């Protein structure tokens, strides 16, 4: 419950930041560019923290089993239950990665290791380039 | 016109921003080339080293030259005034006009 509690508080503050950026964008007059950058960076790094913390506690979330309350009436709130129950993605993202995979399209494994060696080589090359010139 | 010193100062500054533009352009080409390098054709691999080296050497010496300019600012300290003579020069030209008026052989 502790992990889900931390997820709750962090997601609540993320939703609060979203409500903020919403009600300062809803104005008919656009504020200064710099305030928009500050709000963007803060909210976006907060989203990063959301992702990282959700990553950290996957085991606690998975272990939990969902069950409706005995006191909760489904006869009158079945629509509300179904609203939270549904999880299928929005369609546009679906065909989005479908076209993405269409465009992308032992052989695969050796290309994978070739990518490994290119990555390592590029990292070493840029380390050497940084070391070549004194930046301090 | 301005004294020459300001002229080469502004030339050096213009060179500075042109070098910055060249650095941005070379960043564009290196970002371009890395894409196909990730794609998997090794022909343009040698060009990558040259592009990276030229990009870094363009980034460094530009900042170095700008640092030299800001340093020049440090020792350049200590190194209507025209109005004080302005009326005088006006005076001069007016009398010149009188001369042109005074001589009828020069009014042609």
């Amino acid at each position: 419950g502790q992990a889900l509690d931390a997820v709750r508080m962090r997601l609540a503050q993320l939703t609060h930041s979203l409500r903020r950026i919403r009600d300062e964008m809803s104005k008919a007059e656009l504020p200064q560019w710099y305030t928009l950058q500050s709000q963007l960076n803060v909210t976006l790094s907060q989203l990063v923290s959301v992702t990282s913390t959700l990553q950290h506690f996957q085991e606690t979330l998975d272990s939990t089993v969902v069950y409706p309350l005995p006191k909760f009436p489904t006869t009158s709130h079945e629509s509300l239950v179904t609203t939270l129950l549904r999880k299928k993605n929005i369609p546009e993202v679906d065909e989005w990665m479908k076209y993405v995979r269409e465009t992308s399209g032992e052989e695969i494994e050796k290309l994978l290791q070739q990518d490994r060696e290119i990555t390592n080589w590029a990292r070493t090359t840029f380390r050497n380039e940084y070391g070549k010139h004194d930046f301090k | 016109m301005q004294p020459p010193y300001i002229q080469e100062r502004l030339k050096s500054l213009n060179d500075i921003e042109t070098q910055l533009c060249s650095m941005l352009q070379e960043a564009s080409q290196v970002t371009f080339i890395f894409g196909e390098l990730k794609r998997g054709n090794e022909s343009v691999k040698p060009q990558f080293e040259n592009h990276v080296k030229q990009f870094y050497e363009r980034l460094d010496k530009s900042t170095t030259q700008l640092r030299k300019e800001i340093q020049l600012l440090d020792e350049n300290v200590g190194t209507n005034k025209k109005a004080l003579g302005q009326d005088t020069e006006k005076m001069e030209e007016q009398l010149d006009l009188l001369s042109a008026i005074l001589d009828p052989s020069k009014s042609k």
Side-chain angles (χ1 to χ4, degrees), chain B residues 71-82:
Chain B
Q71 287 295 141
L72 283 164
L73 294 174
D74 300 331
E75 322 86 350
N76 270 262
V77 56
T79 44
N80 195 329
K81 183 177 288 293
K82 177 180 167 63

Side-chain angles (χ1 to χ4, degrees), chain A residues 114-115 121 126 133 135, chain B residues 38 42 45 48-49 52 60:
Chain A
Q114 211 265 342
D115 290 9
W121 181 65
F126 282 89
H133 289 282
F135 294 114
Chain B
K38 197 51 184 180
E42 321 315 339
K45 180 175 184 177
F48 182 76
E49 288 103 331
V52 172
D60 306 331

Side-chain angles (χ1 to χ4, degrees), chain B residues 41-52:
Chain B
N41 48 1
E42 321 315 339
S43 62
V44 285
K45 180 175 184 177
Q47 301 302 111
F48 182 76
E49 288 103 331
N50 189 358
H51 288 86
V52 172

Side-chain angles (χ1 to χ4, degrees), chain B residues 14-57:
Chain B
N14 282 129
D15 186 74
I16 282 296
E17 70 267 13
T18 52
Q19 193 167 350
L20 299 176
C21 302
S22 64
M23 183 278 288
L24 294 174
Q25 191 60 261
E26 190 172 0
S28 65
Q29 289 89 21
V30 65
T31 311
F32 182 76
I33 190 167
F34 186 80
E36 81 257 15
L37 294 174
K38 197 51 184 180
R39 285 328 195 201
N41 48 1
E42 321 315 339
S43 62
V44 285
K45 180 175 184 177
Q47 301 302 111
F48 182 76
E49 288 103 331
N50 189 358
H51 288 86
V52 172
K53 198 167 190 175
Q54 294 191 34
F55 173 82
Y56 272 91
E57 68 90 25

